[PDB]
Each structure stands twice: as structure tokens, then as C-alpha cells.
């Protein structure tokens, strides 16, 4: 239930070990006052420092003036930090505001349209995002609820997503979690200890073209519905052939152990792993950081479930875009549908107690 | 680690409250009584496996390559996680299989309550399965696999994910808070309270329905919270709504959470004053609910609330009087009941040969 340090060269919640739970919110900005938006960023940063240490925001959750609404809504009283991280990103639509147009990063690329997509516009996009991850869902929900509340009048929640369980790993020494298709997801990712690979594939560098984003990263989010009925009547072999790994151990086809290296020519040519692997994509590599979701039933007698896919990369054009384009013939396509999308530029870290989210962008 | 599946009573009622919930209501599609009994047996066999952390059937892998796996595999590598699976039978079930005359009188339909705004699509159901565990993926895997075993005979009508505390980092003794920020569960019925369970929770044979002896009756209410309105209320306003203070959760005028309330010190329409047994002719409930958050609604606001569950020996003498007494509750400003269902939760699976519903079906 320990704390993850909030300050750094980088924002936490990226290279950080992946926590069990997610509460992801996309916000739209409803103020045209740049000073008022800067004030909100600083208030949010102050709140995030309290939240990530397990403390109540502002003057607390009780013991103020009886006639005042409490500054903190109280539902995380008595809980631990629970490895809460709070990661902010700026969507491309933000840059149309506050005189920011010339500061939109080129690496913050709008995605192309992909075959098969049915994107819900209402649950897509956003001027900004906050990714809350924690081992306790109440802790994550408290954090989002309180940031939204602080932002009342200046931002609104466009759309949100709860992730009930992780489907990703930045810690290859630890058990790889399974997605709702029953396969381990995150075996060949990027570990938080692999500083060279993080610098190569995840962190923006000044020389890339956008100084304010040095030490930041770029995020793609995709809400991916799973066709659970269709998958569950597939044979074991068909399932394994879809991925290129066996189900129980998660080893590449033909191999004994999960972490043995793929031999891609032994996989079907439309196997997900074969198509996704960096060696199939000119070296393109991602830090995947997604979670499973369920959002009731579909009105047709079935559970509604999926995977909320999150990828961090140094440049959207060299990371998600080439990989996803290469999945055009993926065997997995028969079992999924992308139904939500958004991109964000995730700024560098909050250096110390005097810094604030977005300071390098806004000055 | 694991909670025994077998007993005089189903687990998941009196047994310790786990951190997470996946509750599903099912509608029955078969008209064939024998086919439904066969499903109850297959479900019981699966539940035995699930509650011990094992995959259903022949497993999640290693079978014949050309066969779909019996278990969908998303709980491989996880723990039993104190999973309990509790089945219940809705009033609508009894219109099937010739059962009309074995519907319990204690399984009463709820009246319309003031301020109800019930979504019929997220209300009712022929059956329910309450999956409670500390790991939400364990719960969801159970429901998903039961639904898959059932497909052809039952469908999922509605489902609800929920959460309480996270017990790895939160003391078990500690009362959880709801999303209004108040402690919720201080004055309840405990699993240790064997006599209170017999008085207020378990159906007795003498009550009129022999098949239900050792069972209980369940009321589910999906209760939306008006978070943004609540969060604009003053601290005094919030405490006045409940009759307890927010930080300690002590009754007004008292020092400690567990100090017994003086009801007359609370406002007349305070929640605790209206809900207390002394205000309801002694009517007492076993509350077993969970918070939810589904998302954002369409207007920027938080789709959050309380999935309220109450167990009782008779709906007519438990939930109905208490909820009736909340007609004037100060809390009503901040909540709305948007879903509802009732179930008759049969007695326990006695041993390895028994099956869910055996006392009803014979
Ligand atoms: C519901 C959707 C998806 C499911 C169920 C899924 C499942 C999996 C599984 C089971 C693995 C193998 C274990 C591992 O992580 O190494 C894997 C690998 C991977 N996936 Fe996905 N995936 C999905 C979507 C995507 C998307 C949208 C992308 C990128 C656009 C992606 C990129 C990758 C990458 C890069 C690998 C590692 C390949 C390698 O280097 O060995 N996945 N996926
Ligand atoms: C969102 C809806 C609700 C919230 C936020 C809420 C909150 C609470 C809180 C904070 C308490 C005090 C602590 C405790 O003893 O548990 C309480 C007590 C109680 N509530 Fe509620 N509750 C809600 C709905 C209901 C409903 C629908 C009923 C029953 C029909 C109910 C029955 C009770 C009872 C019987 C008590 C204990 C009273 C006593 O014996 O002292 N509640 N509730």
C-alpha cells in the first residue's frame, strides 16, 4: 500500500510498475482564460501531491467550518496511498486554445482511420486526460472525482473508463497478467528498469523537435471491445494460432517457457505477435499499459467486455501507427473491434514541490 | 484465502464481506424443467471448482486442440480470493417449470416507493448469482464462465460490478466508506451473531415455505448518487443528513463510531434515525452492498452510487418497512433508486453430491 514518488524528470504512471486498477478520465476545457487554466494546473498539481501520498486534498475531508463543503470528498479516508499515480496528458484539441497552436508537437500525430473501427466520438478524444492507477479502485476513483470537482467551471469530464484489472507489465520479474481472452498480456513490453530502452522508445528528447516535451511521452488510448461469444466457441488451437503463443504457459509456438524468445517464422503469418513484434515493424516498440474492462451487458443476453489499450511511445508516428497498420491482417481482428480512441502529449515530470503540471508548455 | 462452498447455508451472506462484487441477473430461456435441473447441477459442479481457485470442467488448456477450452482461462495464476457464489431465484422463475405454488410468500414483490426511477432493463430477473471476491478478475471470470456454461438455457439480463475496501492495505475490522465519504456498515448484523441471523436473516421451516429453510431473501437496489450536488453541501448539511459525523462516524453527541445512537439528538428525517430498528418495530437487515462507478453520464457527471444488497428472513418484515420509513429521508435529495430486484436465496449445498436448488426441484 506504499507510495510511488510523485516528482521526477518524468511523470510517474508510465515506467512505474503497473498497478492493479485504472480510472482514466478525458476532460474538455471550458475556459478561454489562460491565467485561469494555469491556476487550475497548479491547484491540480497540489492536489496530486496530497493524493499520491494518501493525504486529503486542501484543508481535508472534515473539521473545517461546519457551513463549508469539505475540501476533500472523504471516500479515501483510512485508506493507504496504494501506489496511486496521476499522469496528465494534453490532447491535440488543446492547442487550439490559450495561444498554444505553434506548440502542438509533430509527434502528437492524429491517427489515420483503421479498417474495422467503429469509434464512438463521445468516448473518443479530449482536450486533456488524467490517468489514475492504484491497487485500490476507491483510491483511484477518489482522485479523479476530486480533480474533476476542483476543475468545476474550467474543465468537464468528456468520458471516462474504469479498468478493473491490468493487462500489461513493466516488471518482467513478476507474473504477467491475463486479459479476458485468457492469454498473458505484457510478456515482451518495456521494463521500468530498462533505462536505455525507455530513452530510445518512450521518452521525448529535445532534438526530436519539441523542447517543452523533453522527458515527456506520447499516449494512444484505444477502447477495444472483445467478441467474447465468438472467441469462446473457438478451439484451443485456433486461439493459440491467433496469438502465436500457447495459452497456459504463454510461450512462443514450439517453445517451453513464456520468456523464451519468439521464433516468428514458426507462427501463422497473421499471428498477432508476429505482426506486432518490433522485428516486423522496422524496430518500432511500445510501452503497453492497458487494463480490462466490463461495462454491464449488451442488451442481447451477454456480458459486454473488452480491453482499454494504452501505449506510450517517443513518437506516435514511429510507435503505434506503424504497428497498428501492420495489424490490418491480424487474426485477432476477427475477435475485437476498436470503439474508442484518443491521443495525448504527456508532459515531463513535476521536478519538485515548486513545479506544476504543464509548466514547460505554459511557462 | 478460501471460503468453504458447502454448508447448511450458502456462503456469501453471513461469511466475511469480500472487497469486490460481480452480480449478475439471468433470465431463463428453456421451458424444460429437466434441462434446467441439469444446468443447476453443472453450475454447482463449476462453483465448487471456482471457489477453490480451480478451472471449470477439464480446464483452460491442455485439452484436445480442436475443442474449445472448458474454462476461458482469465483466472489462471490467481488465487481463490475468498470467492463465494450465491444463487437466488426471482419471482418470475416460479411461473416456469410448474412452480407457481412454491413461490414463497416471504418473496414479496416490492411496492413502488416515492422517488423510484427504476430501469426495467436493469431490474428483475429469473435468477441471480452474486460473485464476491477480493480480486475482481476472480469474480468476473466466475460470472463469465457460469454464463457460458448456461448459454442455450439462460442469458444475462443485467450485471453490476462493485467494490468495498482493499483488504491488502485496509484493516479488516475497519468500516468501509461509501462514495458520499461516510462509514457504511457500523450497525449491521455480523456473521458471528448466530442468534440475530436466526431471528432476522434465515428462513425457518415454520415460516411457511419448507424448501427455503436455511435460505434467505435478497433485495437488490441500484442507487445512483448525485455526487456533484452532495459535494456542494456543507459538512454540517452532510452530517445532518445521516445523524453521524463524517470523520469518526459517531452518532451526534457521541465520541466513537460504535457508541450506540441517541436517535432524538438527530434531525427527525436523518437517515440513521429513520432506518434504525427502534423506528421500525424492531425490523433489522443484513446489508451487504458495494459501491459502483460505471463511468460518466452524458452530461460530464460521475456515474456513481451504491449497489445496495439486503438479506432478510422475510421481505415484508425487513426491507419493505425500513425502505417505507425512508419516504421522508434527508438523503433522498442526493440519491435515486434506478434498479431493483428480489430473490429467494435457497439453503446451502450440503455436500459434494448436492446441488443448487435441490430443495425446490426435489
Ligand atoms: C484486445 C486487444 C489485444 C489483445 C487481447 C492483445 C493480446 C496480446 C497478447 C496475448 C500478446 C502476447 C504477450 C506479450 O504481451 O508479449 C500480445 C503482444 C503484443 N501486442 Fe497485443 N493485444 C491487443 C491489442 C494490441 C494493439 C492494439 C497493439 C498495437 C497496436 C498491440 C501490440 C502488441 C505488441 C507490440 C506485442 C509484443 C510483440 C512482441 O514484441 O513480441 N496489441 N498482445
Ligand atoms: C446510497 C444509499 C445509502 C447510503 C449512502 C447509506 C448510508 C448509510 C450510512 C452512512 C449509515 C450509517 C452507518 C451504519 O450504521 O451503517 C447507514 C445506516 C443504515 N442504513 Fe443506509 N444508506 C443508503 C441506503 C439504505 C437503504 C436503501 C436502506 C434500507 C432500506 C438502508 C438502511 C440502513 C440501516 C438499517 C442502517 C443502520 C441504522 C441503525 O440501525 O443504526 N440504507 N446508511
Residue numbers in the entry:
A (entry chain A): 55 to 417
B (entry chain B): 56 to 417
Give verbatim excerpts from the published study on this entry.
Dye-decolourising peroxidases (DyPs) are a distinct structural family of peroxidases possessing an α + β dimeric fold that houses a b-type heme coordinated on its proximal side by a His residue. The soil dwelling bacterium, Streptomyces lividans possesses three DyPs; two belonging to the A-type and a third belonging to the B-type sub-families. The two A-type homologs, named DtpA and DtpAa react in their ferric heme state with H2O2 to form a two-electron oxidised derivative that is an Fe(iv)O heme carrying a porphyrin π-cation radical (Fe(iv)O[Por˙+]) – termed compound I.34–36 In the presence of a substrate, reduction of the porphyrin π-cation radical results in the formation of compound II (Fe(iv)O), with a second substrate molecule reducing compound II to the ferric state. By using an A-type member of the DyP family (DtpAa) as an exemplar, we combine protein engineering, X-ray crystallography, hole-hopping calculations, EPR spectroscopy and kinetic modelling to provide compelling new insights into the control of radical migration pathways following reaction of the heme with hydrogen peroxide.
